[PDB]
């Protein structure tokens, strides 16, 4: 008593939109720094009837009959987690329940230290995210600035986390945990040091390694399990997953943190886990794990390497002058055009970008930056030879904006007004299109 | 530079625990009162590229570029639920970002009352959901009873709703937002006395229709837009979408409720939203409208009033001695055998089920009750004939689960130990599969 046809017959409106987003992922030169492609086999995961099941608790206690390949799914997936970060299943345990990585994160700050709980993490601006205590002098923006207490910590002049900074804050602040890890820090994290901090003053140490997963995982980048007691991530930026999260405790540094965090997440904020989401956590750890996904890891640095060098030399400013990782911020200053504006121009070319905060900027709206990364291009083979096709793309990009404001003035309104028609965007768009198209397509 | 083998040859170890899940299902009259079976269009939705989009915000307003067509898909969404539940665009808005039921909720009442505000919810033992304020002497299990301030009223004897109670607590206590609609209560509610003693308070009245959503799109019980400020549900459930949330709320009634619901969602608790959820949610919302949907609907209480009825026929108490709606709460007390004892019986025969507690239990461990629920047998094509099938075979089981405890003892790992091999579990399970494996299945 239902309907089996398939979408294209169901529904042609919605299925037509669908064939859209699909033409123009595969069109775009996709520099999203928090964005990747997902394999057949992993959206052929998330949308298995598996998704069908509910299955509140954990493996083996179960609120509902019938769960017992659901439990072997689940028991899986937090197998190949701890397997795919090189942690022993006796020292760390992990919570692959976690909708997203917003939803990870309070769940984990709460399980830790609760309503009214302190808790330290470096500001949106400096790179930090919502989700690490952000509030502005007006409103609590985040959760975890309101139903947390929360101060925040802004890096220097040059871009690089104050550490010094860090440790007159936790002394005088006096917090519960310490968040480090980023959404868009260029830099690697000197964990050592956080851990020292955090031993100082009896806090916990929370990485949150979304941005920076897959480097971790594979030994390029610093290990924050070695000094943590909680990591977090989510499994759909460099991790190539599904959108999902992870949540790592050290059973080792901190015993009966494993009752915390899963009575946190069940049943303190979740109700039913989406299985078809664990299924698929399952099945991209495996691709993690191997020598195979290592090599595409280092493709990624090797490419933002390369793209940091290329724009360097086109006289485009970085914050923190280059890169450790996945990402670069463009500071566009010196070219007196914001990041809201050459999105704009950049989405008008086919190529995916955000507006990005840099150290200097006291206002979120009319930002002085675009944040870049490579996961995605790298997922389509992309190669160093290419990052400086992508930086002539991002130069011409910027210069177009220029003349663009020239023309229209300062407003983001009269700006839009020149980019319909541009004979030069056109020329550029036929050539991100040409180039984008060709290129593997998952 | 990625792996595109079909998930049977990247994975074969996870494939087979799919093909394993999927033939459980086929093959298992499923009674859980909250699950259902998503067809083919919604599931390719599930799976699409659209997953690998970050489009954080709200259509229009995005804080990434190539967000075009993710911006249409969520637009179609609003304005599909908006028309399934027959609310004018002008009234009512609609968030439809919220990851799932229990998110929805946290976020609709922070937007409504913040942090230490008050709340009134149905105990979880009388057929509240966990979200509305759920807590033990022990310990605040649910947020919702830590984040707010919560107090909870209890059913009758008989397990109906004493609105008499709602108005004593309320006048007491003075929330800010009372809840009504229930996860496992059997009847219709009267939302307009409840907005009768919302108004003598200045409460917002909440009603979360997530187990009855589809008889309140298709006019077969009580509309709760007619009264409440905010509704919210679930797509998964009788609904049969994708597993996410929706959250009404009325405009009309409260100007500037938009913007904060909405920034509770994001950026208050949530990051990037998850658009195949919300193309899924699309897809299913259209089908809810169609007359054809409401025939189903109208299928699901005719089978229900049905296996009500036959459970009865065969002397088994009903909690309120029968349903207006999908549900059945079964008094298990007769047979002085628990709703733990029948859910492992039923799972050994392939009868999906849940244990539930009654009006007369004081212990969340060892629950008086089983609940159930016609939704998805109802999806598989069974009709009322069948509902007398069903509760034969349930009775069949309820007599098993009494020989078993008379033969192995009240300790449940004991219990176990008589299922495997008994030949008339074996003889029920082979009956079971006989006529469930040959239905209809999506
Ligand atoms: C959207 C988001 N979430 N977490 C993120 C972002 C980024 C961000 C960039 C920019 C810019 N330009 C602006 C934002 C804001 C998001 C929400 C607000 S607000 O809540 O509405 N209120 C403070 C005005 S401001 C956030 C990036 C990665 C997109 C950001 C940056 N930069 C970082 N660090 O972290
Ligand atoms: C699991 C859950 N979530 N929300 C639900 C349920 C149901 C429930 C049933 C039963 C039984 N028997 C037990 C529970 C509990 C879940 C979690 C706890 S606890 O928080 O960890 N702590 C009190 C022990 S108690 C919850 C049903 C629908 C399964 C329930 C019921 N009955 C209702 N009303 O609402
Ligand atoms: C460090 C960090 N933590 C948590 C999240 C939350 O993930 P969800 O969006 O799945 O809630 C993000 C996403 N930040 C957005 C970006 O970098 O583009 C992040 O960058
Ligand atoms: C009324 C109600 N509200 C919210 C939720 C939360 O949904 P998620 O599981 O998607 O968080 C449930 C789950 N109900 C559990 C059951 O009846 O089986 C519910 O019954
Ligand atoms: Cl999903």
Redesign the pocket.
């Known amino acids: 008593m239902f309907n089996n046809e398939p979408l294209e017959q169901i529904d042609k409106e919605l299925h037509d939109i669908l064939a859209d987003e699909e033409k123009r992922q595969r069109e775009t030169i996709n520099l ?4 990747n492609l997902t394999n057949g086999a992993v959206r052929e995961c998330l949308g298995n009837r598996v998704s069908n099941k509910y299955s509140e608790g954990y493996p083996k206690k179960r609120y509902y009959g019938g769960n017992d390949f659901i439990d072997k799914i689940e028991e899986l997936c937090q197998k190949r987690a701890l397997e795919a970060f090189n942690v022993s299943d006796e020292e760390w345990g992990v919570n692959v329940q976690p ?7 309070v769940q984990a700050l709460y399980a830790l230290v609760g309503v009214k709980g302190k808790i330290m993490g470096m500001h949106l601006c400096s790179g ?5 205590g952000f509030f502005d002098e007006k409103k609590k923006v985040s959760i975890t600035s309101d139903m947390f207490e929360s101060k925040l910590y802004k890096c220097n002049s040059q871009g690089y986390v104050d550490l010094d900074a860090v440790r007159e804050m936790a002394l005088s602040f006096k917090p519960k945990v310490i968040i480090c ?4 820090y260029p830099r690697d994290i000197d964990y050592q040091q956080f851990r020292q901090i955090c031993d100082e003053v009896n806090a916990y140490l929370f990485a ?4 920076i997963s897959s480097f971790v995982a594979c030994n390029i980048l610093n290990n924050p399990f070695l000094h943590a007691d909680v990591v ?3 499994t ?2 460099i991790l190539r997953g599904p ?3 992870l949540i790592f405790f050290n059973k080792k540094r901190n015993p009966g943190i494993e009752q915390k965090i899963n009575s946190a997440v069940f049943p303190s904020f979740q109700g039913g886990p989406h299985n078809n989401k664990i299924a698929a956590v399952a099945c991209q750890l495996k691709e993690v794990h191997s020598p195979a996904f290592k090599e595409y890891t280092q493709q990624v640095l090797l490419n933002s390497k390369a793209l940091a060098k290329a724009l360097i030399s086109k006289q485009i400013d970085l914050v923190t002058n280059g890169t450790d990782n996945h990402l670069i911020v463009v500071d566009l200053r010196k070219f007196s055009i914001t990041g809201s504006k050459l999105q704009e121009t950049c989405n008008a070319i086919n190529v995916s970008l ?1 507006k990005n905060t840099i150290p200097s900027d006291v206002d979120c709206v009319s930002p002085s930056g675009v ?1 870049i990364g490579t996961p995605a291009m790298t997922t389509r083979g992309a190669k160093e030879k290419d990052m400086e096709f992508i930086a002539d793309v991002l130069a011409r990009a910027i210069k177009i904006t220029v003349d663009l404001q020239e023309q229209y003035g300062k407003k983001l309104v009269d700006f839009k007004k020149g980019l319909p028609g541009n004979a030069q965007l056109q020329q550029l768009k036929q050539e991100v299109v040409t180039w984008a198209g060709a290129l593997p397509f998952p």
Chains 1, 2 share one sequence.
């Open positions: 999203i720094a928090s964005e909708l997203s990585g917003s939803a990870a994160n930090g995210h919502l989700t690490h890890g980023y959404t868009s949150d390694i979304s941005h977090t991530t989510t759909h930026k959108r999902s999260a955000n944040r």
